[PDB]
C-alpha cells in the first residue's frame, strides 16, 4: 500500500541499463539501486515512474535540473522527452551524481560523498543541499518519509568523522 501519467519498466531492463551506463560513466551501480526505489513505485515486475507534472521519470527530474546538465555539455534529449525514457533518465541520474560530487567535495574539503549525501544533493539540488548540511533545515521540506530518512542519514554521515 503506497503512502500518499506513468511509465513502467521491468527490473531486468532497468538493471541491464544501469549496469551498462554506470560502467560507462563511472558512477556506482549501487547508487542507482539505492535511488530508484526511493523515487519511484516498486511493483512486482519492476518500477513505475510518474512522467507528468514538474518532476518526472526514474530520476524525478525537473526541467531546470535536466537543462542544467545539458548546459554542461551532457548529451541528453529535451527534458520532456528524455525524462520519459529509460536510458536518458539513467544517464541524467549519473551525470548529476558526478556534478554533485564535485560540488560537495569543493565545499566540504576532506569529506566523503556517500550515497545518501548524493541523494540529498539529487533531492534538494546542490545549493539547498549544502544549506541543509550546514543549517539542519531543508529549503524544500515537503518530501516523502523515505526521502526525509535518507537526507537525515546523509547529514549524520556528513558530520561524523567515521563509522561508529
Ligand atoms: N530535485 C530538485 C530539487 C529542487 C531544485 C530546485 C527547485 S526550485 O527552487 O527551482 F523550484 C526545487 C526543488
Author numbering: 48 to 51, 61 to 220
Task: Provide the authors' original text about this structure.
P5ΔV8 adopts a lysozyme superfamily fold consisting of an N-terminal lobe (NTL) and a C-terminal lobe (CTL) connected by a central helix. However, in LTs, there is only one acidic residue, typically a glutamic acid, in the vicinity of the substrate cleavage site. Φ6 P5 adopts a lysozyme superfamily fold and our structure of P5 bound to a tetrasaccharide substrate analog shows that the enzyme contains a single glutamate (Glu95) in its active site. Together, our structural data unambiguously identify Φ6 P5 as an LT.
To understand the molecular basis of the thermostabilization of P5 by the V207F mutation we determined the crystal structures of P5ΔV8wt and P5ΔV8V207F at 1.4 Å resolution (we could not obtain crystals of P5wt or P5V207F). The structures of P5ΔV8wt and P5ΔV8V207F are almost identical, with a root mean square deviation (rmsd) of the Cα positions of 0.135 Å. Residue 207 is located on helix α8, facing the hydrophobic core of the protein. In P5ΔV8wt, V207 and adjacent residues 153, 176, 179–180, 194, 199, and 203–204 create a small (30.28 Å3) cavity lined with hydrophobic side chains. The lack of electron density within the cavity suggests that it is unoccupied. We note that P5ΔV8 forms an unusual crystal-packing interaction in which three N-terminal residues (residues 48–50) of one of the two subunits in the asymmetric unit insert into a shallow groove in a molecule in the adjacent asymmetric unit. We will refer to the largest fragment, residues 48–220, as P5ΔV8.
